[PDB]
Amino acid sequence: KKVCQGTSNKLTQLGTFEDHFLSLQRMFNNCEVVLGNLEITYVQRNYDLSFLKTIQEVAGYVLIALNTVERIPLENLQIIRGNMYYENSYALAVLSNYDANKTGLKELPMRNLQEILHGAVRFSNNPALCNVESIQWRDIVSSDFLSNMSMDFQNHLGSCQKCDPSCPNGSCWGAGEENCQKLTKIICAQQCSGRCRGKSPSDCCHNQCAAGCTGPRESDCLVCRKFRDEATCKDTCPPLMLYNPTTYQMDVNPEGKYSFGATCVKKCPRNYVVTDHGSCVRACGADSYEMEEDGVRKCKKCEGPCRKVCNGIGIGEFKDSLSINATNIKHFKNCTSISGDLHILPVAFRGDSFTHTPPLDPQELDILKTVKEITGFLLIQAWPENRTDLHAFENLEIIRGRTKQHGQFSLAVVSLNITSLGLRSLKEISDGDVIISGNKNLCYANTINWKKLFGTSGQKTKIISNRGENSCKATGQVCHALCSPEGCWGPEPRDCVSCRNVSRGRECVDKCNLLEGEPREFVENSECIQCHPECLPQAMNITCTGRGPDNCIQCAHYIDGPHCVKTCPAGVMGENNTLVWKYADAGHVCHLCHPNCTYGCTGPGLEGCPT
Amino acid sequence: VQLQESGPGLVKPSETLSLTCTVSGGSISSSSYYWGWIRQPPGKGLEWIGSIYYSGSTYYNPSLKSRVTISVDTSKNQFSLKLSSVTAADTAVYYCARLPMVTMSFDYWGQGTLVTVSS
Amino acid sequence: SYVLTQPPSVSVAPGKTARITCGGNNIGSKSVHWYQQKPGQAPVLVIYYDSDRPSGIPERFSGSNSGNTATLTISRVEAGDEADYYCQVWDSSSDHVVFGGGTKLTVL
Ligand SMILES: *[C@@H]1O[C@H](CO)[C@@H](O[C@@H]2O[C@H](CO)[C@@H](O[C@@H]3O[C@H](CO[C@H]4O[C@H](CO)[C@@H](O)[C@H](O)[C@@H]4O[C@@H]4O[C@H](CO)[C@@H](O)[C@H](O)[C@H]4NC(C)=O)[C@@H](O)[C@H](O[C@H]4O[C@H](CO)[C@@H](O)[C@H](O)[C@@H]4O[C@@H]4O[C@H](CO)[C@@H](O)[C@H](O)[C@H]4NC(C)=O)[C@@H]3O)[C@H](O)[C@H]2NC(C)=O)[C@H](O)[C@H]1NC(C)=O
Ligand SMILES: *[C@@H]1O[C@H](CO)[C@@H](O)[C@H](O)[C@H]1NC(C)=O
Ligand SMILES: *[C@@H]1O[C@H](CO)[C@@H](O)[C@H](O)[C@H]1NC(C)=O
Ligand SMILES: *[C@@H]1O[C@H](CO)[C@@H](O)[C@H](O)[C@H]1NC(C)=O
Ligand SMILES: *[C@@H]1O[C@H](CO)[C@@H](O)[C@H](O)[C@H]1NC(C)=O
Ligand SMILES: *[C@@H]1O[C@H](CO)[C@@H](O)[C@H](O)[C@H]1NC(C)=O
Ligand SMILES: *[C@@H]1O[C@H](CO)[C@@H](O)[C@H](O)[C@H]1NC(C)=O
Ligand SMILES: *[C@@H]1O[C@H](CO)[C@@H](O)[C@H](O)[C@H]1NC(C)=O
Ligand SMILES: [Zn+2]
Ligand SMILES: [Zn+2]
Ligand SMILES: [Zn+2]
Ligand SMILES: [Zn+2]
Ligand SMILES: [Zn+2]
Ligand SMILES: [Zn+2]
Ligand SMILES: [Zn+2]
Ligand SMILES: [Zn+2]
Ligand SMILES: [Zn+2]
Ligand SMILES: [Zn+2]
Ligand SMILES: [Zn+2]
Ligand SMILES: [Zn+2]
Ligand SMILES: [Zn+2]
Ligand SMILES: [Zn+2]
Ligand SMILES: [Zn+2]
Ligand SMILES: [Zn+2]
Ligand SMILES: [Zn+2]
Ligand SMILES: [Zn+2]
Ligand SMILES: [Zn+2]
Ligand SMILES: [Zn+2]
Numbered sequence: 083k084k085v086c087q088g089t090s091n092k093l094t095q096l097g098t099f100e101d102h103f104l105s106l107q108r109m110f111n112n113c114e115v116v117l118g119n120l121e122i123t124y125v126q127r128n129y130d131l132s133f134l135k136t137i138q139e140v141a142g143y144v145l146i147a148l149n150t151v152e153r154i155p156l157e158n159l160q161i162i163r164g165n166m167y168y169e170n171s172y173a174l175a176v177l178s179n180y181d182a183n184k185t186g187l188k189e190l191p192m193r194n195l196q197e198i199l200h201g202a203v204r205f206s207n208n209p210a211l212c213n214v215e216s217i218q219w220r221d222i223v224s225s226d227f228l229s230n231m232s233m234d235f236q237n238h239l240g241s242c243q244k245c246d247p248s249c250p251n252g253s254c255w256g257a258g259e260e261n262c263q264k265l266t267k268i269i270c271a272q273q274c275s276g277r278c279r280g281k282s283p284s285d286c287c288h289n290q291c292a293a294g295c296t297g298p299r300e301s302d303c304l305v306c307r308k309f310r311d312e313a314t315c316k317d318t319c320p321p322l323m324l325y326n327p328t329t330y331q332m333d334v335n336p337e338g339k340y341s342f343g344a345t346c347v348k349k350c351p352r353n354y355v356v357t358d359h360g361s362c363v364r365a366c367g368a369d370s371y372e373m374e375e376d377g378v379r380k381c382k383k384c385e386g387p388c389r390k391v392c393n394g395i396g397i398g399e400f401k402d403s404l405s406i407n408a409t410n411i412k413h414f415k416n417c418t419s420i421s422g423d424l425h426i427l428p429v430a431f432r433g434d435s436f437t438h439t440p441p442l443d444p445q446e447l448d449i450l451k452t453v454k455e456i457t458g459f460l461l462i463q464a465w466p467e468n469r470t471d472l473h474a475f476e477n478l479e480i481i482r483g484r485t486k487q488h489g490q491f492s493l494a495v496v497s498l499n500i501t502s503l504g505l506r507s508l509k510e511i512s513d514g515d516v517i518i519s520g521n522k523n524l525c526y527a528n529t530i531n532w533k534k535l536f537g538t539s540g541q542k543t544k545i546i547s548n549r550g551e552n553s554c555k556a557t558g559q560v561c562h563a564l565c566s567p568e569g570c571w572g573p574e575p576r577d578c579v580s581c582r583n584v585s586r587g588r589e590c591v592d593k594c595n596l597l598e599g600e601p602r603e604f605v606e607n608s609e610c611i612q613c614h615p616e617c618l619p620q621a622m623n624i625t626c627t628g629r630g631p632d633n634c635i636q637c638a639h640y641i642d643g644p645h646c647v648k649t650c651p652a653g654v655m656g657e658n659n660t661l662v663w664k665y666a667d668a669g670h671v672c673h674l675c676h677p678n679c680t681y682g683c684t685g686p687g688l689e690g691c692p693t
Numbered sequence: 694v695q696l697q698e699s700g701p702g703l704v705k706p707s708e709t710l711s712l713t714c715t716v717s718g719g720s721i722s723s724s725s726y727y728w729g730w731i732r733q734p735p736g737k738g739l740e741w742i743g744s745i746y747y748s749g750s751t752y753y754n755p756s757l758k759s760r761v762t763i764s765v766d767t768s769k770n771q772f773s774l775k776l777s778s779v780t781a782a783d784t785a786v787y788y789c790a791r792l793p794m795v796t797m798s799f800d801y802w803g804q805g806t807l808v809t810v811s812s
Numbered sequence: 813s814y815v816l817t818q819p820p821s822v823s824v825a826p827g828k829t830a831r832i833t834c835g836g837n838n839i840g841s842k843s844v845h846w847y848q849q850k851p852g853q854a855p856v857l858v859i860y861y862d863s864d865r866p867s868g869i870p871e872r873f874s875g876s877n878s879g880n881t882a883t884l885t886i887s888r889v890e891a892g893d894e895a896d897y898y899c900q901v902w903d904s905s906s907d908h909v910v911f912g913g914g915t916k917l918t919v920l
Contacts, residue, residue, distance in 0.1 A: 404750050423724065432907070487795050489725070494794070496843075519864070547863065738896075738911060739911040752908060798845040798857055798861075799855070803854065
């Protein structure tokens with residue numbers, strides 16, 4: 083079906099009345115399913131709204147306000163799911179559809195609106211509006227939202243045509259014979275669950291239907307209450323992950339399909355991405371990024387802060403800016419990649435009268451702590467008082483150095499009172515030189531092996547006039563015993579450029595937990611990685627050889643094929659929508675139950691499933 | 694030959710002293726250097742007057758705050774110095790030198806010009 | 813502001829080592845820069861950052877800064893080294909820069 087998103091402007095008019103009509107016409111032309119909200123506002127008289135007769139489903143709310151057009155042909159609108167609310171709990175608001183002439187919305191022929199899932203409706207200040215007073219809303223709106231209805235019908239001075247005599251209790255949406263209200267809920271018998279087709283229990287609708295049904299089966303609903311897979315209304319789309327007994331592991335279900343609004347699709351439509359919860363979304367929102375898998379786009383959560391490039395000193399708005407001050411530091415919030423330079427000069431903390439800039443607050447320096455990339459250089463000749471290291475740059479890893487200071491240096495840290503550099507994550511300096519001089523309390527500076535960070539042939543380093551190494555070594559300000567001979571950025575083992583043996587996370591350690599330690603580990607690339615929580619720690623041996631439960635030496639609880647699992651699969655969904663149940667024998671090994679044992683077993687055969 | 698000084702060598706007392714420093718061989722609109730004025734009376738020592746960045750931010754000498762106004766214009770590629778209410782003690786050779794930010798020392802010095810105040 | 817103290821005159825034998833001092837209230841925490849000004853010429857940066865040497869300065873020029881006195885040490889003094897020497901420091905917080913009184917170095 084043809085699908086459109088919808089609008090959310092509420093009561094805001096887009097330019098002139100014609101401009102507002104054009105944007106509304108572009109959105110809902112040939113639209114059958116509205117993913118968002120349906121907002122019909124500021125539609126003047128004699129405007130052709132014939133394109134609204136194709137709308138059948140709306141997920142959010144329906145807003146019809148400030149319209150002077152007499153007929154809004156929402157003829158084929160069947161369901162208002164109410165996934166969003168207009169004001170507080172309104173899934174349908176028809177408010178103030180008149181003008182100074184007091185001749186506004188007169189004909190609202192929603193003859194197929196048979197159910198509203200969530201939310202109430204509101205009608206207020208709609209003169210000359212006919213027939214809507216006769217509608218029995220108890221048959222269409224949910225029974226729990228009837229407590230917040232707001233119906234105001236004061237139209238006794240307008241010329242209205244009477245309902246058709248064949249309408250039940252005189253309830254009609256419009257004047258025509260087709261406009262009689264189609265009751266399909268309150269007239270149902272007590273035995274019909276949900277809705278029905280007439281008045282007998284032999285023509286009830288399946289509880290998965292929404293508006294109505296042509297037959298008793300599930301494939302007979304007009305629209306689905308929750309999801310629609312192919313031609314069948316289902317409570318949930320087919321599971322994407324199923325436990326096949328062949329591989330003893332959760333694998334991708336070929337019949338598994340994603341969720342797109344109220345439909346279940348094998349693939350998301352064009353220009354749509356799948357999320358981590360199995361749904362089709364227009365674009366991966368905040369706190370998540372986009373990545374390709376199997377040639378299909380998929381959303382993934384951001385590794386920490388998301389990528390947000392920002393212009394630095396000398397680019398755009400920050401050109402001719404002397405230093406990062408209290409005026410421009412507001413533009414550096416959540417920035418992780420600086421596209422330019424960074425000046426940290428004493429004029430920020432002091433301020434000047436020419437640029438009309440107040441002193442920079444030292445606490446605001448933690449704003450650019452998320453910065454991980456600098457395309458230009460880094461000039462730091464000022465730093466707050468009580469900070470012993472570059473705390474705001476502990477998450478910087480790359481300085482490109484396309485632009486250089488004095489035609490030479492790309493990293494300038496001069497005339498500071500810091501103790502350590504604190505650049506724990508700095509791993510690459512592609513181009514430019516490094517100058518660190520004049521910091522008479524700075525140690526560790528001469529230890530770093532800078533040829534490891536360089537990337538251009540000919541890069542030099544100038545690190546002098548700091549704290550003497552004889553004074554640093556006497557006070558203990560030396561690299562940790564666990565650091566490699568390639569230097570360090572501080573005393574703690576978290577500051578090593580590299581570890582002399584192995585590492586656990588970002589901290590250097592003497593050895594991995596192979597035979598000792600509470601969390602047993604294994605070694606690869608000189609780094610310690612935890613074993614699976616199901617590999618039982620061995621005394622005379624290592625605990626695991628890899629990551630997953632396939633590489634355990636001895637399972638800690640139960641065994642499911644080559645895997646160590648906490649419990650055997652009891653109640654896991656399988657193929658053909660048939661649950662898979664297993665049991666544990668004497669050796670704590672998982673084996674399948676009997677095919678006829680639908681609710682689990684404790685032993686082989688039908689013995690474990692008594693009557 | 695990079696930094697060139699210019700201005701009237703004769704100045705009467707109590708009037709404004711005007712001097713201009715013209716930069717050549719590069720661009721004064723650089724983020725790597727300050728621009729400073731340094732003077733020394735005949736037979737005395739150097740005295741820093743003030744520093745100017747090409748954006749307009751200034752730093753002055755505490756002994757010459759109220760009488761010194763240093764500006765810079767990027768189009769003409771130059772920065773000037775103005776000293777109001779001049780006295781007999783301001784007779785000096787006025788140098789303009791380049792002041793990088795990586796060292797905060799005066800890299801390149803101009804040859805300076807001598808302005809003498811008299812009746 | 814900050815004050816720098818230099819000896820007015822220092823003499824040295826040809827080929828020997830000359831040591832020009834620069835006094836300052838805890839000048840060891842700051843970076844000192846030395847300039848050489850021959851008569852009639854502009855000052856020339858001979859040493860920056862306490863001890864470093866710009867390109868174009870002979871190795872004979874060495875510097876040291878500790879406590880409250882910085883020292884400009886000329887290794888093998890020649891006849892052409894007779895000039896005025898000024899030590900210079902840049903205040904970090906104040907952003908001001910102060911020069912010394914000068915030192916007329918004379919070769920015996
Ligand atoms: C603190 O951090 C701050 C943020 O980075 C930073 O503020 C920014 O400072 C720079 C440098 O001073 C400044 O850039 C200048 O902008 C001039 C005009 O910009 C106006 O108008 C534009 C129009 O879009 C606005 O976008 C600007 O924001 C600004 O309007 C101000 O905006 C604020 C916003 O809140 C309003 O509240 C203000 O009311 C409004 N006005 C004021 C006064 O603030 C622009 O003309 C400048 O370019 C000229 O100078 C350049 C050198 O600096 C030359 O290269 C260039 O050629 C331009 O012409 C030159 O002008 C010179 C004037 O001295 C002459 O000497 C030259 O002869 C002449 N050359 C030629 C060929 O003709 C320049 O781009 C930003 O506007 C400013 N931003 C803000 C928001 O304040 C502080 O500097 C930082 N302080 C410190 C100490 O680092
Ligand atoms: C809807 O779009 C079609 C083209 O796909 C266009 O021909 C038609 O004019 C549009 N309908 C309306 C009512 O604007
Ligand atoms: C009706 O409105 C009240 C306002 O307090 C709200 O608390 C309540 O949840 C609403 N009831 C329904 C069914 O939406
Ligand atoms: C009138 O409403 C009642 C429920 O109140 C319904 O059962 C009946 O079918 C309606 N009348 C007609 C003629 O349909
Ligand atoms: C910064 O990121 C946080 C975390 O995602 C977010 O809550 C906040 O709105 C962002 N702030 C700005 C100014 O974008
Ligand atoms: C660093 O410490 C020294 C000695 O106390 C002091 O003179 C200087 O002002 C300090 N630097 C800053 C930026 O405060
Ligand atoms: C280094 O790490 C390995 C792996 O944990 C360990 O076997 C060894 O004892 C550690 N120490 C040395 C000195 O090799
Ligand atoms: C450790 O475990 C393996 C598992 O096959 C076993 O064969 C071996 O004897 C044990 N010891 C060593 C040193 O590998
Ligand atoms: Zn138009
Ligand atoms: Zn509900
Ligand atoms: Zn597996
Ligand atoms: Zn998600
Ligand atoms: Zn999720
Ligand atoms: Zn999710
Ligand atoms: Zn801005
Ligand atoms: Zn700004
Ligand atoms: Zn910090
Ligand atoms: Zn820190
Ligand atoms: Zn250990
Ligand atoms: Zn496996
Ligand atoms: Zn256990
Ligand atoms: Zn246990
Ligand atoms: Zn089995
Ligand atoms: Zn000042
Ligand atoms: Zn100009
Ligand atoms: Zn230079
Ligand atoms: Zn230089
Ligand atoms: Zn001062």
